[PDB]
Each structure stands twice: as C-alpha cells, then as structure tokens.
C-alpha cells in the first residue's frame, strides 16, 4: 500500500479514516471549536501532520454533506499539501450560507484528505507550440464556455 | 481504456461527453430547472450514477465559462465521488455573483466529471518524522504563504 | 521528467516555478493589476500558455496563504486545463472576504498549476450495476454526510 507517515499533534483526535472501503479520502478532524458567521472564514487546526511521499500531493477537499446542509466550504479548495511539508495541516473553512452560522466542535469531521501522484513537471519554454512540433488540436484556444451548454455562454 | 459503468437514472439526458478529444472531464447535465439567487446554493441532480473503479476517484469540477460569466460555483468543489458510491451524482451549485440570479435549465451542462487514480493510503503513525527516518526538507513547516509573492503575505 | 511546453505570452513574467523541491504546483503570476471588492471576481491573465500532455490534466489551485490572509479564491477551483488547450491560462479570482478589497499587482503569484494523469474514461452504459456484475458496496447509495461527523448531519 502507499504508506503515509502521520503525527497526531493532537493525540486526542482519532487517526483520520476512510468512512468506507475504497473511499478516496480520509476524514480530517477539527482540533478546535469554531463558529463561523455567514461569510466568515477561519484557519482550523486538524491536529495532524503528514509526510506526503515525494512524487505525490495531499489534497484537502470539503465534505459534501456539510457543503449542502450548512454551506460549509474551504477557501483554498482543494488544499494542496506538498510532499515537503511537515507542519500541521490546517483547513481554511468558510461559511458560504448567507444567514445561518456554522458551529464546528472539536472532533467533528470537517474535510477529507486525498493523496495522489503528481507530475513534477519540467517546463520547456518554446516560442510557439508549432516549434515544439505539436499538432493542432480540436480545442485550440477555446475555453471559458466555448463548447456552450448554457444560455449565458 | 478505463471503462466507467454508468446508469442514466434520467434517460432523457445525453450521456456525459468530453467536449474535445483529450479533455479531462465529461460534462454533467442538470436533470432539473433551478434558479439560484445571489449567494444561494442547491443540490442538483445530474441524472447519472456511476461506478468509479476501486483505486480511483471521480471528481466533480465547475466549468470555467459559467464560473466567469455568471459566478456559478460548487460548494464542495472538487466533489469527491468514492469508488463504492452507487447513488446519483448530485452537484452542489452555488451562485457567487452578488446581484444576478443564475437560471439553470434541465439539460444544461453544469459541471464536469474527471476520473483519476487515487492512493488508498495506509497511515503509519509515528511520534516524529525523525523516527520515520525522514530527511529534513526545504519546505519544513512552511506554508500559508511562507514563500511570499503578494504584499499581504 | 514529465515535460510541459510553455509559451510566455507575457515574457515580462518569470516562468512559473515550484517554491520548494517536491512542491505539487508551479506558481502562476498575474499579468495584470486588478482590485477586487468584496464578493467580486475577475478573469485574470497569467501570461502563459501550456501544452498539457495527452492523458493528463492541468489543474489551477488557489494558494493557501492568500486564501486565509485575504479571502482570495478561484471561482472554478480547481481550474481544469485540458490537454488540447493552447490558449492563455486565465484565473477566475474572487474575493470571498466580506469587507476588505484585494489588490493584486502584476507579478504577484496568484495561483498554482499542478499536472496529473487523468483517466480518459470510456463510458459503458448499463441498466443497473447488477448487470455489470458489480458487487454490492459498503457505501451503497450513501453520500452527502451519510457517515455523520457533525451535528447538522
Ligand atoms: O482555470 C481555468 C480553467 C479553464 N481554462 C481554459 C483551459 C480549459 O481547457 C478550458 C475549458 O475549461 P472548462 O472545460 O473547465 N470550462 P468550460 O466547459 O466552461 O469551457 P469549454 O466549453 O471550452 O470546455 O478553459 C483556463 O484558462 N483556466
Ligand atoms: O489546505 C491547506 C493547504 C496548504 N497547507 C500547507 C501545506 C502546504 O504544503 C503549504 C503551502 O500550500 P500552498 O502552496 O497551497 N499555499 P501558499 O503558496 O500560499 O504557501 P507557500 O508560499 O508556503 O507555498 O501550506 C495546509 O496546511 N492546508
Ligand atoms: O459532488 C459530490 C460529492 C459527493 N457525492 C456523493 C458521492 C460520494 O461518494 C458521497 C460522499 O461524498 P463526501 O465523502 O465528499 N461527503 P460526506 O463525507 O459529507 O459524506 P459521507 O459521510 O457519505 O462520506 O457523496 C456526490 O453525489 N456529489
Ligand atoms: Mg465522506
Ligand atoms: Mg469544458
Ligand atoms: Mg505555495
């Protein structure tokens, strides 16, 4: 398996775990009680540090239930935990509900951490994609809604 | 190819497809008409269920055109569809424009689904990264803007 | 290494680089000065175009420091740069702070670009997961907070 070394900076919280076999992420706990008014964010400690392997990345994603039920999100989602980072994972929670505050208690599961390979790319500067001998593509320079699919596009 | 079994829970919608060869995602349709006032979210049915292979994850990402043109986003982006999930994919749309409502019609393309491998990690609890014999890293405990690049950091 | 061809559409900006060895992303610069009032977004040029290899995807993620310090986010995060795209990478910045405007200067590092493999899936339509001979799963149709972990779930 791909092992991930982890330090429970706050040993009072359980180790992050998958809710079900095959789940992509292990759920991260809040070390803290925090209450977010509408529109407010906080930087919340999870009580863990990890050593993402070289060649990989840790990614902090919101949980869907809280997202829908109370509008909880993460400002920098997907949080990007670098392989060299040995500090505490912190989660930038934000309340995107307009009216109802969100109360987080220490020990709630407030996000999930995935680990994936990542390509540590070597940039090759060219003067044009033609010089790199790249074939023309279907997409070309099309983006930002170029394929349609909604009246505003 | 990597096959993805899919059930069209709503057979009136086309199968999700890539807009162009090589595109990362297949676009998901809204099964529903929904109108989001500024700041409001909804949990929108896509009319599909999928079986992400074990060892992989499905990821629901916003489309860029709607993001810019009308401020449409996804509260839990990137939505994390687990390999064991066999329910309907639902998209937590949110209107991040301050003033203009977003109207979604059934059959609009409102998000995109990627599939990637994911490392199903085995946590190894250590008392310190030293005990794991890990070398010191350049980054160390630096994060949350430690490398600079903006006046607020 | 995985090479990524890049055109500096704006040669006055440095090539994107990793802040530290092993970091997942290369930081993207703003080509532009832009000032975002609370709640406003902009579509910001980065001054680069890239050729993500076929079979891969580029992903534009927010930086964590700006996310926490000033509430900067990205409407379509994680931005999905397709392998066929040869246009300029643009970043849909948004100010999620309620009260303080964010000022971006040309040359600030405003996001980071990761490159990952992606599964270009072949959809296989089935009438039920049973027909595909898929085993029942632990998770079943559970989602959107089914595993608990917060009082609102
Ligand atoms: O952050 C981003 C995301 C996308 N893009 C460009 C590159 C990408 O290949 C292209 C299309 O992205 P999406 O598919 O995510 N958006 P949308 O579906 O609205 O556009 P299109 O209809 O062209 O696919 O837009 C950016 O420049 N920055
Ligand atoms: O959700 C997150 C994201 C990042 N981090 C930590 C780990 C990561 O390696 C580190 C830097 O993340 P980013 O590169 O995404 N943010 P930024 O570029 O602002 O910080 P730095 O200048 O240190 O790279 O911050 C977290 O604790 N939680
Ligand atoms: O965008 C999404 C994200 C998740 N889902 C479904 C599929 C996924 O496997 C399931 C659980 O997703 P999360 O783990 O991200 N959310 P949460 O942890 O709140 O739910 P659960 O407690 O069931 O794991 O919800 C969607 O339909 N759309
Ligand atoms: Mg979950
Ligand atoms: Mg698209
Ligand atoms: Mg960084």
Q: Is the peptide bond before A78 cis (omega within 30 degrees of 0)?
A: yes
Backbone torsions φ then ψ of B66, nearest 5 degrees? -60, -35
DSSP track, chain A: -EEEEEEESSTTSPPP--SSTT-S-EEEEPSS-EEE-TT-EEEEEEEEEEEPPTTEEEEEE--HHHHHHH-EEETTSSEEE-TT--SEEEEEEEE--SS--EEE-TT-EEEEEEEEE---EEEEE-S-TTTTTPPP-SSTT--TTTT--STT-
Chain C: give the shortest CA distance to residue B124, in Å. Answer: 21
The alpha carbon of A24 is separated from its chain's Cα centroid by a whole number of angstroms, namely 12
- Among all bound ligands, the one having the nearest atom to the CA of A80 is 2
Pocket test for ligand 3, best of B80, B92, B115, B118 (most atoms within 8 A of CB): B80
Q: Where are the domains of chain A?
A: 1-153
Q: In angstroms, what is the resolution?
A: 1.5
The token pair at B127 is 């008392």
Alpha-carbon span A71 to A69, nearest angstrom: 6
* Closest residue by CA, ligand 1 atom 20: A145
Question: Strands C2-8 and A121-125: what pairing?
Answer: parallel
Neighbours of chain B (3+ CB pairs under 8 A): A, C
C17 within ligand 1 shell (Cβ under 6 A):
no
The token pair at B128 is 């310190």
Experimental method: X-ray
Question: Would the annotation count C64 as a binding residue?
Answer: yes
Chain A's closest residue to C91, CA to CA, is: A144
Architecture in CATH of C1-153: Distorted Sandwich (2.70)
C140 within ligand 3 shell (Cβ under 6 A):
no
Alpha-carbon span C99 to C70, nearest angstrom: 10
Q: String of b and e for A65-86 (b: at least 16 CB within 10 Å)? A: bbbbbbbbbbbbbbbbbbbbbb
Sign of CA dihedral A75, B95, A66, B90: negative
Cβ atoms within 10 Å of B101's Cβ, excluding its own: 12
Cβ atoms within 10 Å of B126's Cβ, excluding its own: 17
B64 within ligand 1 shell (Cβ under 6 A):
yes
Contact B153 C65 (CB under 8 A): yes
Question: What's chain B's Rg over C-alpha atoms?
Answer: 20
Contact C39 B4 (CB under 8 A): no
Residue of C94, C137, C142 with shortest CB distance to B96 = C94
Q: Is the peptide bond before B100 cis (omega within 30 degrees of 0)?
A: no
Contact B84 A26 (CB under 8 A): no
- Nearest residue to C6 via CA among C85, C67, C70: C85
Contact C24 A138 (CB under 8 A): no
- Nearest residue to B53 via CA among C52, C83, C147, C129: C129
């Amino acid at each position: 398996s791909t092992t991930l070394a982890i330090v429970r900076l706050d040993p009072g919280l359980p180790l992050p775990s998958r809710a079900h076999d095959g789940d992509a992420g292990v759920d991260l706990y809040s070390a803290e009680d925090v209450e977010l008014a509408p529109g407010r964010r906080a930087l919340v400690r999870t009580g863990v540090a990890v050593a993402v392997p070289f060649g990989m990345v840790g990614l902090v994603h919101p949980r869907s239930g809280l997202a829908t039920r109370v509008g909880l999100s993460i400002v920098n989602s997907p949080g990007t935990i670098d392989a060299g980072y040995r500090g505490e994972i912190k989660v930038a929670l934000i309340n995107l509900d307009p009216a109802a505050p969100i109360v987080v208690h220490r020990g709630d599961r407030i996000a999930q951490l995935l680990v994936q390979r990542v390509e540590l790319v070597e940039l090759v500067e060219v003067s044009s994609f033609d010089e790199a001998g790249l074939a023309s593509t279907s997409r070309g320079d099309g983006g930002h809604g170029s394929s349609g699919g909604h009246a505003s596009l």
